[PDB]
Structure 1
């Protein structure tokens, strides 16, 4: 059959996912952090290890400083990204990178040097036979199974909305907002000071991120929820720190996700996500807005708070004309949907013609990616 399954690697600001072409689910999922020791080593006889990558960095987070190589969808330290890719290929999947083609994902709007640098790294350091760069929001529409629709994708570093009609994308209506889960985590660290809890270092940022994943939700009405929380203490939850201490957040459960809809809490002039989606729909042509309203697709791990679908539907219905229906399509496994789309892209027969070969790279330099990728 001579068909070799192509590795699909989804790289985000928060977590790295990796698997094979045609599989249902990724084989490896792990956080994208690189940690380094910050204290004296006195037990002579133990082994020395310069850096910690992935789950092992999270396991020993006490004695390490953790740094994210990718910030706001842009990778800043390339050596950490190379270490993460090496760990992915050799310790998570146990495959030879020179055997399989690799498919990579990136944000829609970004600096142009990122594509060239990943192309050069994948063609020189890892000796892959072919590679391709795709946009995550298109892969979400592949995972949905519908040809037309508007895709909003919010991850750990970037939020972006694209419209697509019958497989044709409108590049002038693509909108990018720099609001994501890391800013929400920082805001939760800020507003937890009011109750008396102080979190400063990076391990505390991981703890606050876990608290946000456990005990945050979106209120359908913000003022009603604020009045209810002020009236009684029924809307309170308790969390347990790793050292045994118990904290009670209470009112802060629905104030952190509200910054997604009102960015004035963070000092940003830019509008909310619902406003961005409505503006992206309104920037399209007149007679495709009917199809774009009924096919709104949510994606990314940031869209996993409870009550996002109902609140976004209510806000968009308030903005849109009342004569036609608006529904929000939120699959339960949306967090991995981008990767799933990539797998479908690696399974199509015509996509074997779309790979960037090594000979083509050798002829055209790192600039071939702008010509051969959207």
Structure 2
């Protein structure tokens, strides 16, 4: 292998992952947001922010670095974050080592403008020697031994569906849902509000709650039902009637208990109410009358495959993609999720056999994007990736 050690940085819209290419896990996972506390001042890091957030001090406000595109939109802040990472976590001059960072799949447009802002940050400001940009869905797929794959990423910003054929990304078939993890935080909060008393500028408390009890609730209460929930209900009812009538147990009546710490208070949901939260990802027409069933994850996956079949047979691409389905993302770890994504895919494409792949290790999908970039950085040849040097920048600067 090569005589080098890279810094690997992944700026997700929710989490930021950083570490060196020479070890199996990242040195740090910190929030892709910061507190601006006021003479201004910028707080980064999971415990630093949760401490400051709990202080409940006026003028403290949480801002974000990554928009819903998965792309950085506040570049002055991003530099401060990178400085923070290099200074306090990796503890190395940014000038020494090659850098590997990620971008999300796009349709192609915002690409050049981004690349430029990265030149300015990597070169003008940090003095990085050289960097590679890997495309998240692509790296994750490669890290998994796959050159062609339908990559279904369910993160905080929403679902990102990306067909990848023979190492190439099909941009026009790239699809980004708007409903994911962060959406789930909103719904858990709005729904539980009356039991916990509670029912931008108030960003600090929203954030702190999202990062504390709401995060635990998601990891322990929510489940995704295997089949359209409204149907599951009608069925379970229809069956329940017969057990009852017959003599003279509906699974949705099981209760689940969550200790809510801030008030030392038990919150009990029935299994249906637990299934209900993720149902919105699949049938978002159930919150507002302003969402079409087509904004739901099932129709969306289908849409993106069909748009893959338009290249540039279809019942071949369909077959390729569907035998290499990759399910990934923090939110994809919610119990029942893989199976519903599968059921939802299988019924839009009955003629085909689906085979899906997913990291089964809890940690590794939360940071599978970073894991992907890592396996790119450990590729044995410099010729395997585009590596931008200070040169490239100079030459772009000409007219």
1:71 aligned to 57, 61, 67, which one?
Answer: 67
1:101 pairs with one of 98, 102, 109: 98
Deviations 1:2-34 (A, max 9, x none): 822111101101111112224322222122221
Per-residue Cα deviation, 1:84-139 (whole angstroms, up to 9, x for no partner): 21111111111111011211112222734333212211111110011222211101
In the alignment, is the contact (CA less than 8 A) between 1:217 and 1:307 conserved in 2? yes
Supply the distance in 2 between the matched residues of 1:86 and 1:265 (Cα, whole angstroms). Answer: 44
Cα–Cα, structure 1 residues 238 and 288, in superposed 2: closer, same or farther, change >3 Å?
same
263-272 vs 328-337, which moves further: 263-272
Task: State the Cα deviation string for residues 344-366 of structure 1 (Å, max 9, x = none).
Answer: 21122044662111122123239
Give the aligned CA root-mean-square deviation in angstroms: 2.8
Distance (whole Å) between structure 2 residues aligned to residue 240 and residue 297 of structure 1: 35
Q: Of the candidates 257, 271, 275, which is equivalent to residue 278 of structure 2?
A: 257
Aligned position for 1:370: none
Q: Structure 1's 134 and 163: CA in aligned 2 closer, same or farther, altered over 3 A?
A: same
- 2:273 maps to 1:273: no
1:325 and 1:352 map into 2 onto residues whose CA distance is 33
Count of aligned residue pairs for this structure pair: 357
Which structure 2 segments of 5+ residues have no match? 238-248
Deviation at 1:232, TM superposition (A): 7.1
Aligned equivalents of 1:12 and 1:307: distance in 2? 24
Question: Where does 1:300-311 land on structure 2 (aligned, <5 Å)?
Answer: 300-311=329-340
Local SS of the residue matching 1:218:
coil
CA contact (8 A) 2:195 2:267 kept: no
Moved more, 56-65 or 85-94: 56-65
**TM-score where L is the length of structure 2:** 0.80
The structural deviation recorded for 1:256 is 1.5
CA distance in structure 2 between the partners assigned to 1:312 and 1:177 by the alignment: 14
Mapped to 1, the partners of 2:225 and 2:101 lie a distance apart of 36
Q: Aligned to 1:234, which of 246, 254, 257?
A: 254
Residue of structure 1 in register with 2:306 after alignment: 282
Equivalent position SS for 1:8: strand
Q: What's the TM-score once normalised by structure 1's chain length?
A: 0.85
- In 2, the alpha carbon distance for the partners of 1:168 and 1:309 equals 25
Q: Which runs of 5+ in 1 are unaligned?
A: 39-47, 368-374
The answer as to whether partners of 1:89 and 1:97 remain within 8 angstroms in 2 is: yes
Is residue 2:83 matched to residue 1:86? yes
Aligned counterparts of 1:162 and 1:37: Cα–Cα separation in 2: 38
Q: Mean alpha-carbon deviation: is it higher for 91-100 or for 182-191?
A: 182-191
**Cα 1:266–1:351 shift into 2, 3 Å:** farther
Give CA-to-partner distance per residue, 1:137-175, whole Å, 9 cap, x none: 101101211222211122222432121222233222222
Task: Select which of 24, 38, 52 maps to 1:60.
Answer: 52
Aligned to 1:341: 372
Matches of 1:167 and 1:232, distance apart in 2: 44
- CA offset digits 1:50-99 (Å, max 9, x no partner): 33211211233222432222231243433332222111111111111101
Q: Distance in 2 between matches of 1:137 and 1:365?
A: 30
Aligned to 1:372: none
